[PDB]
Amino acid sequence: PMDDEQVLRHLDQLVNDALDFNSSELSKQRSEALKYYFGEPFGNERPGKSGIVSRDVQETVDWIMPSLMKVFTSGGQVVKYEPDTAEDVEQAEQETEYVNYLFMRKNEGFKVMFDWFQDTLMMKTGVVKVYVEEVLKPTFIRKDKKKREIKVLCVKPENFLVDRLATCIDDARFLCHREKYTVSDLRLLGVPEDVIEEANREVWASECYTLLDVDGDGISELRRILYVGDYIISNEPWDCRPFADLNAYRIAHKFHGMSVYDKIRDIQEIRSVLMRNIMDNIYRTNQGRSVVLDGQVNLEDLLTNEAAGIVRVKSMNSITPLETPQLSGEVYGMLDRLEADRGKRTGITDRTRGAAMSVNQLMTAAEQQIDLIARMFAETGVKRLFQLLHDHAIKYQNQEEVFQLRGKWVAVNPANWRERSDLTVTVGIGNMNKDQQMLHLMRIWEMAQAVVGGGGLGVLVSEQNLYNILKEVTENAGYKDPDRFWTNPNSPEALQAKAIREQKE
Amino acid sequence: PMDDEQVLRHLDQLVNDALDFNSSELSKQRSEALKYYFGEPFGNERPGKSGIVSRDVQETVDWIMPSLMKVFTSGGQVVKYEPDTAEDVEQAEQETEYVNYLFMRKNEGFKVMFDWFQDTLMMKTGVVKVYVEEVLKPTFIRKDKKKREIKVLCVKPENFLVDRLATCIDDARFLCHREKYTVSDLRLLGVPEDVIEEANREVWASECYTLLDVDGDGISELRRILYVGDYIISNEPWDCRPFADLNAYRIAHKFHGMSVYDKIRDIQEIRSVLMRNIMDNIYRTNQGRSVVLDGQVNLEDLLTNEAAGIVRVKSMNSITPLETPQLSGEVYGMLDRLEADRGKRTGITDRTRGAAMSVNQLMTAAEQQIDLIARMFAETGVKRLFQLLHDHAIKYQNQEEVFQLRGKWVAVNPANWRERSDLTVTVGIGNMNKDQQMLHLMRIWEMAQAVVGGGGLGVLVSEQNLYNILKEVTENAGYKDPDRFWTNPNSPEALQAKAIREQKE
Amino acid sequence: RILYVGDYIISNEPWDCRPFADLNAYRIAHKFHGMSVYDKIRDIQEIRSV
């Protein structure tokens, strides 16, 4: 109660605790992933011998990421709002296109999402922050003053001090995000002084989202605090925490989640160890295990590496040269076995893609788990879409949409639609375009001609509903509105293309 | 009888008994499950040697989850109510869609069921709790006051102290569920004080469903007790225990159930130990068992691993080096055999899926027992569906449905029908859409053309029942009502599309 | 923009937009200078040669 300063050192204690725990555990884990991912020696490679590390999770990322790009960077149909049937054309797809068109190609595009993937699959934690900014350059026609925008940036979750007792975004009582915010930002804020840490003061700042009882009252909302260096803070009640804290696998009841590397490492290190061991044994056989004595062969055969090739014992030629056993080629079948295991861990198709033409593309490449991970990423980003929708429905701007047409009012007073639907893009019904479109076209075309033989075109499903029937084809073909208009609903075109042109001629 | 404090001590004793027994046995079993799933070393791996642990249960879970998604996360046809033949359209499908649309798209999706799967198949027990809450933010148009919601949460059954002598939901005389419910919830209740256990008091609370004699009368119903810390409790005559307690295998007469881990223990352990033994023998062969003596070879050949390669005996080189036997590659064939068994343990098709096109999709993929487990999951969720329908038929809200059309009265006065039918989803009649729809279309198209040749349309099944005939196709296509409306029942549509348009022309 | 040649007459001028690209060839982790296509085929080349 009446907390204005105890919040400062309480937040400092929370920041220090998150520093300690998060740093130790998560930094050690993500740093292990970093060292064995890049393929540099792990430190157990002695000098004078080839410490070659065979990178195997690098191609694993090279495999997983493009499928993520296909499923996610594919049109604006990924997430829908699907509110009550009345208000759909009004704001549902309208606010959907607003938030996508503002997030895609207006909020850092998909690059932040790519780095988000990496953060949740490389260094075990994918989390970003969404915030606001102003606009400048007025007519001093060109009136650009105080326009508000809302955009997202990766937080570098190494600078995302937070308790491990959340397991979800709306569970952390203390969210500390660390940034530089140099003397330029100190001046823009207005603090004339600095901290211990020349414009290159490399000053360090932190932002804390946390709730307490600072008013001697009930449960308070989220509080945003700009605890920088125990200096002038920006304390403010907050409305929604802009973070997402991915874990990439929907692991059990814990905040920080394991990475994709954490399950392919076994394959990677086993591969590298076996290949290095086999070449080392090959080299051991190649050099020649010739036993040299003491007193005789004072040159140790010149280490069996020079261009002389003379043993030069002295007088005794007993010699007991042990023969180094060779290594069979069947251990190189373990290379293929490890490739298959690395597959069957994430990309179960050992090949690039392991009558009925394998409907749904071999049922999504044999119920591929990457589709599940895409499902979980999309459902997590549902919260991001809501967060952006809130930060814009509080106030963003009056800007016009590019939603296939002209006409869109201000999106600072939409209906949030209280939920985002993103089922039809993943392990759900998820009939991918290459499959949904083909199944639709084939079966619908064949029922269509069957009924036209049997029933007809106008009495049954007609050119206005055949409009939508062909439409599914059009939208799946990538061109949604303009290339295949075909609307013909009820118009001067429809009065001359469905009723007059047919009932009289 | 007339028990007010002896109930508290009796419940404390039952809490302690459940703690001891359930904690010890089931917690140890689920901890073993967690340890062997996570693939960390079992503890028998000595330092200096590769303790490789093969996570074999993980890809099995990855195999079973998508099938769970096909069976469950596919349409709302999973459970019907099966009332009298009259009150079907009235509430049966109506209340079915009400509970679904409240549970899907309004109750956290399937994530809680995902965790329920995991708990019952990996952590050895899947149980969840259904409860109620209120709604806020009125006009201060926007009138949101006292609206009641009912929703379910996973309990982490480690916090579900309960006797092992139930074997069913309606058999536990003592259901103790543990939670945190920190000081915020204490103040929300109104308790000014706390227990032994700073707003972070990390307090812990328990909830008890138990029946006893507290009124000096006949057999009383259940009672709910908010036994927290021997502090202010919340007792109430309770009516329905909102729990599910899945076991994932329908084990014999005992409460707690086995995990899938409990049956893949042998497969995973054998695979890991065999590959570890093979690789260890490989390393032993590589290093070389060279017999050295005392006094000579004081450098122990530099452990036969350095880059010098000079044995440096002294003067004697008798040497009796035994040769380590190699390991044949046929054990890698038994690795394929183990993969085949790991199939044949749960997913009896060792492959991804092991003339008449293999009718019913090779008879549900070689009569896969995963479909049986899905059946028993569905019958388990039958009770949960009834619990929800009760908690809403007592009081939920007046809100309408999204059941293909606008219009639904208050679901606080439905008819529960006392029964939830879910037969057609599994091994049962269960003609899956993938085969039901295809057999339907083939047989119907051929019989229908035969009838047209011989009998005709109006004589036999007509356009109004040809409507339903095409319907099975349409509902199998994912668009049930709207895309193929075709109802044409008796209307201006029937008057100009089935009655007058054909007889007079 | 500063034409610091040899600590001599510089062509100092405010600039509007920096004309550079600084690729890294692989979109490597959070660092300016990135690893090349060399760093992943050098191992294969070295093993082949040896």
PDB file of N, CA and C in Angstrom, chain B residues 25 59 196 285 313 325 431 441 495:
ATOM      1  N   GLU B  25       3.661 -43.506  -4.492  1.00  0.00           N
ATOM      2  CA  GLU B  25       3.579 -44.446  -5.605  1.00  0.00           C
ATOM      3  C   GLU B  25       3.494 -43.724  -6.943  1.00  0.00           C
ATOM      4  N   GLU B  59       9.093 -40.070 -30.062  1.00  0.00           N
ATOM      5  CA  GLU B  59       8.541 -40.166 -31.411  1.00  0.00           C
ATOM      6  C   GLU B  59       7.269 -40.999 -31.423  1.00  0.00           C
ATOM      7  N   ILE B 196       0.709 -20.324   7.950  1.00  0.00           N
ATOM      8  CA  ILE B 196       2.167 -20.365   8.006  1.00  0.00           C
ATOM      9  C   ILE B 196       2.763 -20.357   6.603  1.00  0.00           C
ATOM     10  N   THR B 285      37.400 -51.417 -29.179  1.00  0.00           N
ATOM     11  CA  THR B 285      38.165 -51.927 -30.311  1.00  0.00           C
ATOM     12  C   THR B 285      39.097 -50.861 -30.872  1.00  0.00           C
ATOM     13  N   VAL B 313      58.675 -49.069 -24.874  1.00  0.00           N
ATOM     14  CA  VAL B 313      58.710 -50.110 -23.853  1.00  0.00           C
ATOM     15  C   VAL B 313      59.963 -49.962 -22.992  1.00  0.00           C
ATOM     16  N   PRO B 325      36.811 -58.797 -29.745  1.00  0.00           N
ATOM     17  CA  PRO B 325      35.880 -59.197 -30.807  1.00  0.00           C
ATOM     18  C   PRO B 325      35.007 -58.032 -31.250  1.00  0.00           C
ATOM     19  N   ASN B 431     -17.580 -45.684 -39.393  1.00  0.00           N
ATOM     20  CA  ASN B 431     -17.157 -45.607 -40.778  1.00  0.00           C
ATOM     21  C   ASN B 431     -16.549 -44.231 -40.976  1.00  0.00           C
ATOM     22  N   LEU B 441     -20.521 -42.598 -51.517  1.00  0.00           N
ATOM     23  CA  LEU B 441     -20.656 -42.005 -52.838  1.00  0.00           C
ATOM     24  C   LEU B 441     -20.683 -43.077 -53.915  1.00  0.00           C
ATOM     25  N   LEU B 495     -41.768 -25.224 -54.605  1.00  0.00           N
ATOM     26  CA  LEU B 495     -42.823 -24.948 -55.567  1.00  0.00           C
ATOM     27  C   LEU B 495     -42.278 -24.603 -56.947  1.00  0.00           C
TER      28      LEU B 495
END
